[model samples]
Target: GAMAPSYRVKRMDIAKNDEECVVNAANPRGLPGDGVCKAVYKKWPESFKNSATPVGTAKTVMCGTYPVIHAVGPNFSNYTESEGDRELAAAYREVAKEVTRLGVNSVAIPLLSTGVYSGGKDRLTQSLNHLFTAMDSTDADVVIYCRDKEWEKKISEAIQMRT
Candidate 1:
């Protein structure tokens, strides 16, 4: 039973989940006051604040009900596909490791580096592929939260290819 699929992908509001901690693609500058980070910061400002660190790093902020994982991914504007993909993979790996370390049952991860850092659809696909692959080895149940139906389909297809 424990060997079953350790992760799943879903198209849903990450904020609605009270059962799992959320992972944020944070800016390394400790200023995630815009975009998706803004929403998470609104929910738990202190947690977000505490997690603020240099880029290419990972930090966990414990909120009472649902904690947040802040992964300082690449600076979107200053990276190439290979570089961005590497950072994206590193962020996912950090999240997975932290999830296991904290003994958490589940975590919801967004598509990192795709927001303002978005290169295009091809970059999105490549990043997703990189993320899912990195997550394959972790024991904690993983959720790739999709922003919309189109992404849900794309992520789902990527997950299918992995299994």
Candidate 2:
């Protein structure tokens, strides 16, 4: 199937009978907080482990229910503003690589740098372009979940222009 642009922040609708594979773009506080992640957990409770929180900013976890990859810090706004925040880009690559490592054929992602963290559309698009290029396989169907239609259109246009 041809790859398509997706929301960078929203709840992922997964079927109960569907083989499980999810990527939570959570912060250090973890899944229960108010964000797109909380929405995701609400929709797919079977895929989330309520008590588990990521140990650090940008750390990966393999909990019993589903794997989580935390990409935000206490200073979500700060990281977005920092000049040294390419780590956000690296975090995206890391999560994508890990998802591939786990052998999932389909996975969804949120805008890694567009939330509380601070990359604009152009920067976020460039970073995702880089991460997507480095992935080992294109066999996996990638979805970038966003919160609103404007974001969705921006991402869609960005990916099309780049690729």
Best by lDDT, which number?
1
Clashes of 1: 0
Error of 2 at 122 (Å): 8.5
Per-residue lDDT of candidate 2, residues 1-163 (tens digit): 2255322333333222133355565655555555655765665555444435442234445546555554442234444444434555556556666666676665666655455444333455654564465443445666666656666676677656645
Q: Which ten residues in a row have the lowest lDDT in candidate 1?
A: 1-10
Would you list the C-alpha lDDT of every candidate in the order shown?
A: 0.71, 0.52
Misplaced by over 4 Å in model 2 are 1-20, 44-76, 80-84, 119-127, 130-138
In angstroms, give how far residue 136 of model 1 lies from its true place.
Answer: 1.1
lDDT of 1 by residue, 20-118 (tens): 678887877657556668777777777764576766667888878567888876755778767766777787778777777777666778777777766
Cα lDDT, model 2, residue 61: 55
